[PDB]
Design a protein around this ligand. Structure first.
Ligand SMILES: *[C@@H]1O[C@H](CO)[C@@H](O)[C@H](O)[C@H]1NC(C)=O
Length: 130
């Protein structure tokens, strides 16, 4: 489902939609042991040979790197080279491990280009539980 998000600095890209599934109500509640589909539709404002995704889980106010299956954007539904003014659907999974504590977390997800400029940067509040 499309979710409400806060843009944290998209600069060389424009976010059209952030879709997390399954997420029938918000803030999305994520169950420990389950993985969620993330589909970010954005339009590029530049070109780039590569793209890298970095995710952080802001817990108790502290941003901590968040493990994801693939950090190479070009292996995440984006056919690189990324070209200017083209629309892409970045797709990945947000794994909620069984060991993760049951608390509120703000997930920050960004995709950067060859110069580390952000195609997109967004944050969404989530609730982790059993
Ligand atoms: C991602 O979202 C776009 C736009 O809604 C859709 O066209 C595309 O099929 C989706 N990709 C997935 C979920 O595999």
């Amino acid at each position: 489902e499309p979710v409400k998000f806060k843009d944290c600095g998209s600069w060389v890209g424009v976010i059209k939609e952030v879709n997390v599934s399954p997420c029938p109500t918000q803030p999305c509640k994520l169950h420990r042991g389950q993985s969620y589909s993330v589909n970010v539709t954005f339009t590029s404002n530049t070109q780039s040979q590569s793209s890298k995704a970095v995710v952080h889980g802001i817990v108790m106010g502290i941003p901590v790197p968040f493990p994801i299956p693939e950090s190479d954007g070009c292996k995440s539904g984006i056919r690189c080279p990324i070209e200017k003014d083209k629309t892409y659907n970045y797709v990945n999974k947000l794994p909620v491990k069984n060991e993760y504590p049951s608390i509120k977390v703000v997930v920050e997800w960004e995709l950067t280009d060859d110069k580390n400029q952000r195609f997109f940067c967004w944050q969404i509040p989530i609730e982790v539980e059993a």
